[PDB]
Design an enzyme around this catalytic site. Structure first.
Site, PDB file in Angstrom:
ATOM      1  CG  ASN A  68       2.902   0.428   3.527  1.00 10.23           C
ATOM      2  OD1 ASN A  68       4.049   0.769   3.261  1.00 10.23           O
ATOM      3  ND2 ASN A  68       2.457  -0.805   3.302  1.00 10.23           N
ATOM      4  N   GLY A  69       1.024  -1.243   6.242  1.00  6.00           N
ATOM      5  CA  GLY A  69       1.598  -2.113   7.258  1.00  6.00           C
ATOM      6  C   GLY A  69       0.621  -3.164   7.747  1.00  6.00           C
ATOM      7  N   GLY A  76       0.113  -0.322  -4.943  1.00 10.51           N
ATOM      8  CA  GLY A  76      -1.196  -0.924  -4.783  1.00 10.51           C
ATOM      9  C   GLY A  76      -2.161  -0.431  -5.838  1.00 10.51           C
ATOM     10  CB  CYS A 128      -0.822   0.022   1.288  1.00 17.05           C
ATOM     11  SG  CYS A 128      -1.833  -1.480   1.497  1.00 17.05           S
ATOM     12  CE1 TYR A 165       7.177  -7.430  -5.848  1.00 19.03           C
ATOM     13  CE2 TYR A 165       8.733  -9.087  -5.045  1.00 19.03           C
ATOM     14  CZ  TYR A 165       7.428  -8.622  -5.161  1.00 19.03           C
ATOM     15  OH  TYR A 165       6.405  -9.354  -4.561  1.00 19.03           O
TER      16      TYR A 165
END
Ligand SMILES: O=S(=O)(O)CCN1CCN(CCS(=O)(=O)O)CC1
Ligand SMILES: O=S(=O)(O)CCN1CCN(CCS(=O)(=O)O)CC1
Ligand SMILES: O=S(=O)(O)CCN1CCN(CCS(=O)(=O)O)CC1
Lengths: 492, 500, 500, 492
Positions: A101-102, A27, A1, A258
């Site tokens: 994000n997590g 995302g 995200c 990546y």
């Protein structure tokens, strides 16, 4: 995200939209933008789809205000594609919105406590909604108005003592301003930037990656430190405070492989330079272990690997050739009446340049191997194009354990490397040879760019979870969630 | 623009859609797919947008049948986003649909003759609708049914004597089959492939590029020859015929420079290898001419130039570094009341990795220079990222003339190279140095892959038009078309805005 | 179906859209509007849905021009929701578009001759596309330009000798103007009106009903005569001509019973007055035949029957009460896994006011009885609301035959009245009593408004078809069309569902 | 606005949708449906548009559960067409959603108190969001779990002591059930019904009008009493409790004139029968005051007036004729480039049957007169069609004051009757004669059906506001809100 927050002096709707378009690789399932308007009210637009499809002119017109946050979602366990996207919102105390994000490793327990101690209902199974509710609950312990920066930081510090996991967060509190904070292990990425408008006006922004600051002309200031919180008032005053005990930098090593863009600088490390270094290490390993092999050409599997493979070919003194071309446009497969619904393919995402494989022993380079399904088909394509021997090198070490810190990974069972050695994996994917980067080599590749980082978050590779609260019981719990998410998405 | 035609033995809707997705780089303005169903009627879906947005489940459901054609549009003068997309259709004689990639230089005159002699009305400004009507009128000259292959080829031959320009076409005639044909000069690309199902049951396909054949698992047979036509009957039989008087192979050199996909083989030339060879030629030219310069790194301007720059870096013995990253996703810039601090146009497209430019004399490599505006902005971005000297190399020679064969290029007065020496262009764009590929080198780079091709279509570079019918009256007429198109697009916006 | 054509001196897009909204009761399946723009090209927007849903700002913006035609579709055999809507179009000769309300009883044969003699392909199963092609081929017989009025009328005359059935058409020919014409028997409705702008500048309009003229402020001139054609040039001149050999006025009697709007005047007959007269006739019949019955109240079954029932109540000296209210808004019934307790089909349409039925012998009045299924359910609703005796009266005589002139009626074996006496129908629907309008009474009720009309099109009531070409082979062929249409609609649903 | 709540034993999504389609005349601007699913979570779909356009198959699939509420909105001051529609939702305590038809006369003060005492932010300017927050705030005073019916009724009783105005409300509390309650003056309509599934299962529903119960096959039980609350548990147990002091029945008289459906029974009065009675009273008044006038025909202005006019014609011994036909389908007017945007018309909504006006003195009957704009144009149409004298009768008395209880009315200035006598109004609309129903006659017409009602809510007619908190200051405040709403809708 991916997350972004802008505390500006002029409308931020287009800028948040723009920032999200360069964080789109983080995302593509859903996007959301929320601003605080001139009336001190939130205006929100969030929906499934790419950013360019989610926000039409009419939504942009509604997103009024000089402060706002944005989010792009990558589906994970508990936050399926069918579920409500971020940012989430609560109306008390004051009005708070948050994007994250997590992943919180103790979400289920927090949800129980929220219900039993605060009577706060969680409507989705998203840990971000839970995170927002814990923060809100802590902000609700104040009597005086408005809150001072000390009170906001105290609420974040208390939140940090309650939750566990990984999180880069950005939030807004009506009548106060914007807050951004990072987990105490510095796992998820978060940078801070500024844009000087004039002598007295300076805008601030936080984003998952520095490319979001670049695209908007914001000057990079620094990464937000592990455990640190940043608070920018409505008025443009910046405060910062360490809100965790024993903070330490354990950046997610997987972002570098990546996930992140190559042009970003995360915890002082150029993602691009770290990737070239990975090719250097892998090339050195291949030149040592595969000394006697006949290899005619090195062919990267697009797109993250093109540079890694270039460095490998350089180290090996072999030609680098574009044997595979990534189809920039991929379409869907339709379930039509009568017609047999045929094969799920990599040919839809990739094309083999026939002339580049013919009667050659080829060394293919990929960034990593997860399920092993694509590599299997890719090797087969190399053979169909006339390759004799087909070898595969992975820029990342074997992926054997699930990530519970924000990166979507399938369960342990679906990871080809789980409980398997290199040769068995090789036989399953049908390669003539398979070689993975050594974990210590990956570490040195990244660490060479910032020797200050002592340890990274390496769980998908070594099964060591820094938060010390991951056992099989938990992983099984996560699978039941995936199962429920599957039923929901199947339904749609 | 890109086209695809499949004459199969099983449903073609999904395969045509997939073929168009890999041909999507040839035009993202609109897409269209038409099929012949079990009742011998056309089923069509076309609209503006990417293939993935144009065709939804309900449209695929209606696209029934075992034979069909597809098109993706790149907007050109006479075919703006505002106008009707391809494929076009006529109901007489028989029911004929066609799709085309190219441009007819005598479209005006053809439209007049069609009106005067045949009473055939052309509803759009698309030369493709005209091509279809000329074809349809030639097919209306027979008095026995069904038409024989020879009749259909005779009609295509009659059409080629009438029309002029460049074209790769695929069409279908109800009750007969699919035809594909290429201009007498082999300018526009077109390949043929097959997929065997069993004894005497093979599917055939034509497409602008071989990647469309690859993606669908079709065996590549060959390029459709200049002036040749292919006819595949509904019963699966193959026929072909040279339908041009003096066919010559003059492939568009632009396809090789950047328009086509690198994994394609056009007229036996790998696009990828040709581009690598372009890098070899340009690098040797740079080594010879810029011998006294200190260049620290070679940086490609994404995306076509990556391999060209890599090869140039190899020839110069200099490091190659990813200095610019192309923003894969670009959004809309909404016109909002008082858009305070607009995001730079160049930043919407690319992003610079600051570390790769800091205190370095950089050599940037781009595929070509047209208006020169974005080139000037990229140069600026590099100095801003900390570069000291900024040099620019173009894989393509100077672009000085408009293309009237199907590639959208601005008018001559709009091309920065037009009427200017390299050093003047250099000053305008702000580069410390500027160097272009020599045309003969570009030709050798591509010819090296197939020496049989002796001449390429080079008009944008040399002003020599093989159809010999390009004059100022024609160019001016094209500018008019472009103006009417601009008006149509402007109007479409006017109330999209007032609707709020 | 309803049609509208306006030849104005100012933009027609909004006026055609508004005209179609008041003609919306003639068909809600699809709508289409086409205009001729300033460049002599057609601009078209058609799709399934109500007029208000079909045309959005971006579509109106493209519908430029001062002349245009419109259509709203009611789905019939050969023209299902799944198929292409009107108006249809052809590009040769000249560019011709047409819209029609009616049905050609020799469509099959016309399609064959068009294929064999002219090589004209018909892409849909719509007899309107066929009508257009016959018209277009007749117009292709001249060799001087432009066509003269006489040439256009000659083409319409040739068309009438070839086609058979019922039709009200409006069309446009690029470079010439708008034409409208009616079948030799004046079966389908069509009126003409004008709007003066200044000295020798008048706009003309044709529409299925006069309410479309009213709503736009056009002065009603008259009904287009049976077999007559109207031609309005682009320059605003009016021409007319009888284009049929033996025109007779045989207006569809169904338009009067319930299809047309009450505020319309068709062939000089007010639809409203005719319906009031239908009530007078039916009430007198009831007073004569049901003299011994105790009826407490007269209750109309909304919406067409309100005034008919009021008049019946007046003749019987009984109170009129609103016992049923029609649900103005009806939604979709989504197919959900295990739809527990489905809402009754009849309740979706109507709602009963319990107080108006409780312990009363009620006389319900409906405009007609077709399948008899909803009639049985309405009767049930009344007993459920507490009625003791429930009687039913139909403003229309027994419907025993299918209509092949443009009104969608099921096949003969599907009509409850088919092969049954009134008392048998009564038992089936569960009424304590059932009475129908006598056909001669219905005829007198309408004729009273215009004695010049001596014969009406009564086939659904008497099986007498004026075109004398209706046989079982034809009916069977229509059933086939209906079956293929059903398949097409079923398929469209299949993956609308699987897409979830 | 219209509301519906169904506490069933099987999925309610289609049933709520169906109920809302027959209450669609109560508001066409927006619709919303919210259910409680098998996981005790709310599933919601709300958007602008008719019910048939708002809910597509995919939204219906998401609306899972056996309990749910629905709302259709009619735009009002503070709840413009551009603003967030209902039902509104809060996440604490427990999870509560509420839909409301009405208006709170002390909304601004409540909003201040919510902010200052509870730190609860109100994000819209809708009084329903405020109502939900007061209720939530009162429900938050409990420690034990779950809440007993006594606690829920205590919270509603406390809510009733705090808010003022008019309101028919329906709400759901997660883990508890459905509650429905009516203001202490019984102003806004609300009935209760049930549907027996078997020996042990009975579903319950509440709706603004009884037609919603009819269409679903629910048996009518009774109107919810003024001040009363109904609570149905998850388990299907029904509780009722009087939650206001000195409750009294003052039904909105305006519902009977034209707002409600004729087939509904509101506070034991058939709306249809009350409307026929209105025609009887008006006919008697016309036969007395206009004894000497030459009137050839009585023509109703569709659609509510057709029956009223029928009764008038009957009383007068004059023919009733359909002179006007309402266009069931109305379209929009487009703002096109170059084209002059011409006239706003009634001709778009109405057509005159020419033959019915020619050389006749006509008496037109309308349900009421508000701005007087339509009547002006209608009279003009009657003249264009050839009418000689044109008279107009109004089934309702003069509308001189604004409604602040839930019925959208323009401000006093825009009401033609405000500060004007009958003859001046007549001259402005250009009629040859104008006559309004007497208020006491309207009262008797409605009251004849239920003599138990002593007084109705008649403010738009007499300026007497039963809640005693309406003064000019407040009305001016309401206008500023309209002004803000206008700017918002203009913007869209
Ligand atoms: O951003 S916008 O305001 O346009 C859309 C708001 N968004 C719509 C979807 N719901 C969840 C549906 S459900 O999970 O409750 O079914 C969350 C809120
Ligand atoms: O002119 S044609 O009828 O051929 C074309 C008809 N049009 C496609 C519909
Ligand atoms: O904040 S703003 O006022 O700009 C938008 C208000 N927003 C619109 C969308 N709905 C949910 C849609 S759905 O979940 O019912 O589909 C929540 C409220």
């Amino acid at each position: 995200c991916g997350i972004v927050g802008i505390a500006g002096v002029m409308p931020v709707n287009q800028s948040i939209y723009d920032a999200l378009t360069v964080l789109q690789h983080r995302g593509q399932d859903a996007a959301g933008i929320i601003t605080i308007d001139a009336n001190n009210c939130f205006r929100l637009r969030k929906a499934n789809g790419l950013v360019s499809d989610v926000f039409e002119a009419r939504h942009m017109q509604r997103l009024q205000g000089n402060m706002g946050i944005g989010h792009v979602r990558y589906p994970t366990a508990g936050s399926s594609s069918a579920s409500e996207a971020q940012p989430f919102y609560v109306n008390s105390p004051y009005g708070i919105t948050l994007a994250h994000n997590g992943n919180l490793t103790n979400a289920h327990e927090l949800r129980k406590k929220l219900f039993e101690e605060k009577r706060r209902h969680i409507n989705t199974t998203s840990d971000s909604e839970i995170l927002l509710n814990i923060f809100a609950s802590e902000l609700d312990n104040f009597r005086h108005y408005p809150l001072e920066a000390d009170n906001i930081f105290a609420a974040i510090a208390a939140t940090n003592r309650l939750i566990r996991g990984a999180y880069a967060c950005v939030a807004m509190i009506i009548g106060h301003g914007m807050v951004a904070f990072r987990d105490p292990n510095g796992i998820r990425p978060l940078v801070l930037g500024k844009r000087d408008i004039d002598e007295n006006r300076t805008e601030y922004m936080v984003a998952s990656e520095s490319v979001a600051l670049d695209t908007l002309g914001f000057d990079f200031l620094r990464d937000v430190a592990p455990g640190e919180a940043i608070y920018i008032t409505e008025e443009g005053q910046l405060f910062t405070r360490q809100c965790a005990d024993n903070p330490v930098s354990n950046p997610c090593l997987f972002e570098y492989v990546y996930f992140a863009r190559p042009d970003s600088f995360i915890d002082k490390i150029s993602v691009y330079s770290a990737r070239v270094n990975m090719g250097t290490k892998l090339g050195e390993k291949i030149a040592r272990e595969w000394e006697d092999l006949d290899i005619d050409v090195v062919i990267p599997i697009p797109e993250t690997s093109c540079d890694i493979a270039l460095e490998i070919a350089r180290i090996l003194g072999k030609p680098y050739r574009q044997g595979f071309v990534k189809n920039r446009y991929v379409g869907r497969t339709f379930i039509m009446p009568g017609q047999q619904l045929r094969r799920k393919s990599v040919r839809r995402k990739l094309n083999a340049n026939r002339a580049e494989f013919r009667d050659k022993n080829v060394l293919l380079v990929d960034d990593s191997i997860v399920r092993g399904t694509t590599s299997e088909q890719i090797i087969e394509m190399a053979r169909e194009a006339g390759a004799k021997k087909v070898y595969l090198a992975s820029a990342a070490p074997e992926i054997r354990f699930p990530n519970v810190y924000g990166i979507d990974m399938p369960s342990a069972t679906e990871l080809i490397a789980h409980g398997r050695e290199v040769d068995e994996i090789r036989q399953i994917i049908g390669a003539d040879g398979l070689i993975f980067q050594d974990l210590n080599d990956l570490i040195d590749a990244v660490r060479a760019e910032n020797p200050d980082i002592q340890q990274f978050e390496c769980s998908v590779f070594n099964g060591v979870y820094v938060t010390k609260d991951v056992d099989q019981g938990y992983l099984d719990f996560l699978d039941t969630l995936r199962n429920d998410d599957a039923k929901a998405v199947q339904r749609q």
